[PDB]
């Protein structure tokens, strides 16, 4: 039956999550008496979808697909928190811990490198009202934090920094400072992304459900030099539930 | 924007880069090895082949 | 050396710090710039001095620098062999007081916590005080290059380089 | 005017005290009996309101909390900095000798 | 960048106004707006002094 990690190493299995079978199509009850927890929740990108940037405004941009660069490193995994039985019978997600961020870079038509933090950072993740069973009609709703794609120690190629570096463009020692202020004076950028969660596949017995998930976020403003881009993210996951 | 020969290239049928653009406008698309990229390295090669067979 | 001698005198004279500082030529403060030292250029870095660091226009005047305690202090001036150089300001003794990090995480010295300030006598700025920490800091950047002065920098299209004299 | 959040907050009390709610946790082995148990809980239960909320995280001993009395007058607090707190931060700042 | 809209003219008793167009063969070319018959209306003057259509 079960792999060991000489049987994955190296064959891409690492960055998917589990599956269940077809034949999973139960439902897992909820007893709003008991506390729970997601012991496991991880997430899978399959699709990263940018949105364009018009010089028209006129008429509505699109999310355009892009060509991953980083290789089989953007999957988030082993991330687990509380599950809250709320008073109206919806469940609550609030995720504590795990591996939940990945840097990814995506390349667009043409070029354009697009890297994002992709993260559920934080993630508090709502069920609808009375949800008595989990089923494959369940879905969570939420929100994350999106930090900074690079944090406050981060220089860059000029040795600039918020929290370490030159605070100006020494190579030019005599410029006027004013044009170069946003360059020079780095922002440590904090926004909130949105996720869904579409169950597909629920084990009654084991606790464990799979589904389709599509988030958005905004990828990496490079400390507030440049407008970040809107991002989607599509992909599935899987997520073990366990009485705690 | 002063482009000669592009359009020749997309008169007969060359619309794409290897970068994933296309000249009407689309994403995604892959366009094999004719796109403007090839069709400009089949045309220096075949320079060379030229250079080289005049010398003979 | 000079300037502070004259300065010296009127003081001594009973001339008011302003000035003081306003009978400093602008041709002699100028002198005691480094963007006129002519080792301070390169190579490859072709044309006038004014070409790098601008046209200059103008004295600002002579910057004084004090902490919170109300003590001057004095920034540590480029030596020509640095293309670049850390600004670090100490009192009258040579002991440091006052500097910009570059790691903020232990920082001791930082303007923002030793409540530097700049005041100006003589030059356009004769009489003015700065005391928010970016233009405090900007002009101590300034002061590591001896006397601050304005430029056109837009004439000649100039990018903030320092280029050589003809006596280089 | 954009503004160096970092730089900015040197000139507050985060340049003066250890600051219960952005400090990285080195800084507590400033003073005796804070490092690293103490500094631990501290910064595990931040941020405070005030610096005596420091005395109401639970479990604390007696002892302990007659060590944090004695050093609230080495502590501040000040609105918590995403750029300080982030990244594991507060635990590792990339500062090492 | 972008298409601004098309412009409508109009006088102050409200009827619509049409530029003269430039013909290719001029490098530069006079302000003139006349109704839907081509009658004239408005323009931009060159001497003001007996100026009689000037938009203002
Ligand atoms: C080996 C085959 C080959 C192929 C498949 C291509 C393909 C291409 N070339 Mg390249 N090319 C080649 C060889 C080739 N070329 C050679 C040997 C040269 C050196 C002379 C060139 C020099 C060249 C240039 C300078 C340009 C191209 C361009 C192009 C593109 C548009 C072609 C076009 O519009 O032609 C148009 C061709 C005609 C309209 C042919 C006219 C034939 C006349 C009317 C015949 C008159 C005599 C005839 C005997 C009359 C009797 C006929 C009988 C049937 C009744 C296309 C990607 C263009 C481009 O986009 O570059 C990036 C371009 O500007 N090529
Ligand atoms: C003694 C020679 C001499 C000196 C000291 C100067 C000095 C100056 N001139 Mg004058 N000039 C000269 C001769 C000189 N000039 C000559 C002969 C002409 C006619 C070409 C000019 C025409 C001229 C113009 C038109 C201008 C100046 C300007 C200037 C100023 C800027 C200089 C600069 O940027 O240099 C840059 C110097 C270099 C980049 C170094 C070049 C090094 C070469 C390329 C090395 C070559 C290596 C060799 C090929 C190796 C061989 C290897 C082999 C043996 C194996 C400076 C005051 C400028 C100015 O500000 O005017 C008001 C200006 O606009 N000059
Ligand atoms: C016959 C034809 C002659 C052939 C000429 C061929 C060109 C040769 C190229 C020489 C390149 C040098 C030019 C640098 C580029 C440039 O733009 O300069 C351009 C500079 C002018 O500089 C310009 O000034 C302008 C305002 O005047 C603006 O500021 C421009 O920004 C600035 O670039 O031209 C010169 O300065 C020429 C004089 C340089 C004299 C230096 C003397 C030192 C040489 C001794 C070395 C001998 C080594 C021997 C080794 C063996
Ligand atoms: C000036 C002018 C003119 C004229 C012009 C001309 C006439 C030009 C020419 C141009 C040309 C005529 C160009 C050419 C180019 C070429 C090239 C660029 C080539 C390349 C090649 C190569 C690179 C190769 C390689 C090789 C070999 C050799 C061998 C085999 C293999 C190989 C492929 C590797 C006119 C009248 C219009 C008027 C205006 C001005
Ligand atoms: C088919 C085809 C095509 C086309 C093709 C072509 C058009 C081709 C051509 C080809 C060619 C165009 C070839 C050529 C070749 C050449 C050669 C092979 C040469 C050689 C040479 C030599 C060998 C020389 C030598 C020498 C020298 C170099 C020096 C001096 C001495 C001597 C003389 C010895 C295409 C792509 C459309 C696609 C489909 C298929
Ligand atoms: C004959 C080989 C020529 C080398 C081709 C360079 C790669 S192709 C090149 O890629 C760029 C970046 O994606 C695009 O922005 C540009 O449109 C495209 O032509
Ligand atoms: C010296 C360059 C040789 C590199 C050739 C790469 C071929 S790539 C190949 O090309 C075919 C013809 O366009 C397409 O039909 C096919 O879909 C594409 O994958
Ligand atoms: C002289 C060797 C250089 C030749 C490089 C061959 C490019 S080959 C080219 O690659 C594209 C992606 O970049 C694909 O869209 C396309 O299917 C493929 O034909
Ligand atoms: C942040 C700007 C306010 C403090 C003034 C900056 C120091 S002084 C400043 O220095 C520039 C070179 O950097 C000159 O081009 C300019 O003429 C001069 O005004
Ligand atoms: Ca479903
Ligand atoms: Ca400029």
Same mark, same amino acid.
């Given at each position: ?21 077809? $034949? ?55 991330? @687990? ?20 961020? @990945?840097?990814?870079?995506? @390349? ?26 989990? $089923?494959?009609? $369940? ?54 992304? @949105? ?50 | ?56 | ?25 602008? /041709?002699?403060?100028? *002198?005691? *710039? ?5 080792? /301070? ?26 902490? /919170? ?27 440091? /007081? ?22 100006? *006598? ?16 900007? *002009? ?29 | ?16 005290? #250890? ?5 990285? #946790? ?15 809980? #501290?910064?595990?239960?931040? =941020? ?9 995280? =639970? ?7 007659? #060590? ?30």
């Amino acid at each position: 039956q079960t792999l060991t990690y000489d049987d994955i190493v190296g064959t891409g299995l690492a960055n998917k999550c589990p599956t269940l079978d077809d $034949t999973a199509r139960g439902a897992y009850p909820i007893d709003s008496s008991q506390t729970y927890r997601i012991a496991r929740l991880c997430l899978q990108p399959t699709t990263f979808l940018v949105k364009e940037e018009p010089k028209n405004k006129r008429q509505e941009a699109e999310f355009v697909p892009t060509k991953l660069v980083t290789r089989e490193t953007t999957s988030l995994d082993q991330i @687990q928190g509380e599950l809250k039985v709320n008073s109206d019978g919806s469940l609550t997600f609030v995720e504590e811990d795990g591996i939940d961020f @990945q840097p990814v870079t995506v @390349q667009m038509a043409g070029g354009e490198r697009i890297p994002l933090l992709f993260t559920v950072k934080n993630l508090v993740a709502s069920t609808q009202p009375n949800v008595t069973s989990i $089923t494959t009609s $369940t879905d969570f709703k939420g929100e994350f934090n999106v930090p900074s794609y690079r944090t406050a120690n981060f220089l860059d190629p000029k040795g600039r920094g918020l929290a370490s570096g030159y605070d100006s463009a020494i190579a030019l020692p005599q410029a006027k400072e004013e044009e170069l202020a946003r360059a020079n004076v780095k922002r440590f950028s904090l926004t909130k992304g @949105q996720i869904s969660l579409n169950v597909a596949k629920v084990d009654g017995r084991t606790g464990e459900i799979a589904g389709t998930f599509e988030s958005e976020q905004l990828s990496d403003d490079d400390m507030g030099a440049h407008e970040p881009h809107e991002v989607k993210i599509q992909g599935v996951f899987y997520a073990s539930i366990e009485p705690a | 924007q002063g482009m000669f020969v592009l359009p020749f290239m997309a008169r007969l049928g060359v619309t794409g880069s290897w970068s994933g653009w296309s000249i009407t406008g689309e994403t995604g698309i892959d366009p094999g090895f004719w796109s403007f990229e090839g069709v400009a390295l089949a045309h220096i090669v075949l320079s060379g082949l030229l250079f080289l067979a005049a010398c003979w | 050396q000079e300037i502070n001698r004259r300065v010296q005198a009127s003081l001594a004279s009973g001339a008011t710090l302003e000035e003081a500082w306003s009978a400093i030529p602008e /041709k002699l403060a100028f *002198y005691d *710039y480094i963007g006129n030292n002519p080792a /301070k250029g390169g190579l490859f870095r072709t044309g006038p001095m004014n070409k790098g660091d601008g046209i200059a226009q103008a004295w600002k005047g002579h910057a004084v620098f004090r902490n /919170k305690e109300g003590e001057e202090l004095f920034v540590r001036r480029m030596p020509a062999f640095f293309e670049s150089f850390p600004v670090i300001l100490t009192d009258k003794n040579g002991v440091v /007081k006052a500097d910009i990090p570059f790691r903020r995480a232990e920082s001791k010295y930082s303007f923002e916590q030793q409540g530097v300030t700049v005041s100006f *006598y003589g030059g356009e700025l004769n009489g003015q005080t700065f005391t928010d920490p970016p233009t405090v800091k900007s *002009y101590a950047r300034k002061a590591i290059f001896g006397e601050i002065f304005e430029f056109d920098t837009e004439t000649l299209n100039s990018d903030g380089i320092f280029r050589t004299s003809p006596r280089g | 005017e954009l503004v160096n959040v970092v730089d900015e907050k040197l000139g507050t009390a985060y340049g003066e005290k #250890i600051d219960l709610n952005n400090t990285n #946790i080195a800084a507590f082995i400033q003073y005796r009996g804070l490092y690293p148990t103490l500094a631990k809980l #501290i910064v595990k239960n931040a =941020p405070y309101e005030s610096v005596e909320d420091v005395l109401n995280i =639970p479990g604390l001993t007696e002892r302990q909390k007659q #060590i944090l009395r004695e050093n609230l007058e080495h502590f501040t607090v000040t609105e918590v900095e995403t750029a300080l707190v982030e990244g594991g931060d507060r635990y590792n700042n990339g500062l090492y000798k």
